[PDB]
Amino acid sequence: LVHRILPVAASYSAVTRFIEEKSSFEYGQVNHALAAAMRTLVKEHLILVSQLEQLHRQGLLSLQKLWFYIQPAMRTMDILASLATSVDKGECLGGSTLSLLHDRSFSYTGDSQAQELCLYLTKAASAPY
């Protein structure tokens, strides 16, 4: 059960490295906006782990309750960590990472749990273009 709850960590350290490296002036005006609105989701992730700690302090949380509690943010991180691999993998910058955000938003057209996150990353990353 620890292993099944461990993928949200590999999708947290990989997600954070992309927000440091692709914030430099060299990567271009849009790659900066994509990571600057991806850093806001990391602040909210930290806000969740602080609430879970208070429940743990009162002896009122267990590994079966934690497993159900983190499921919503296991998905948000998974969409942010895959998208970051791709924007980095193709060395995309400028508009090559404003098309990759339009197309991924279509990929999930029925989900609405992940569609709102992507549709948001494109409103934020297309402000400079």
Binding site: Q64, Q71, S107
Partner: protein, 192 residues
Amino acid sequence: HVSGASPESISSLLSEVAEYGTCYTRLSHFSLQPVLDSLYSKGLVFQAFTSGLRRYLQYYRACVLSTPPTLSLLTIGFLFKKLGRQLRYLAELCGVGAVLPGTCGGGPRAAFPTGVKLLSYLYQEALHNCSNEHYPVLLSLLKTSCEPYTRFIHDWVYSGVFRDAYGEFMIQVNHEYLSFRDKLYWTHGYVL
């Protein structure tokens, strides 16, 4: 042989719950595998089906957690019986769940319909079990499943835009249209 308060029927009773569990694991697996962003074998519509299935699996998981931690041994099974069959049925509805029933090997690996065929396979199964208690589960899967086609329809309806990846949508377009002439306009068509 030797056991701490375990007459065989307890093991047999434990075996029946187990059947339910095996399905959960396999099913949780069948839906869990996400699209991966490159599901060529399955269609856009197959990726919609799985998403919906998980929503059910999540609701199924929540009921298991809700169970009073304190309850009688026999009472726990009698409580979950309705659900236990409900899921095994859900399992068989999909080939995977049907597969590894336990009465057979994993070799059959029955092919699952995909594209329009899947949407239809479901509708027919809808009419077959319409009066049965298991029918509401299907209506739900279908409603969500049908969403992609509607968008396709809207895109090729209010708009004339022709858009597809795996060509699961029945209408088809060719390069004869790019000839842009009356004879080749007819030569370009749609599937039957």
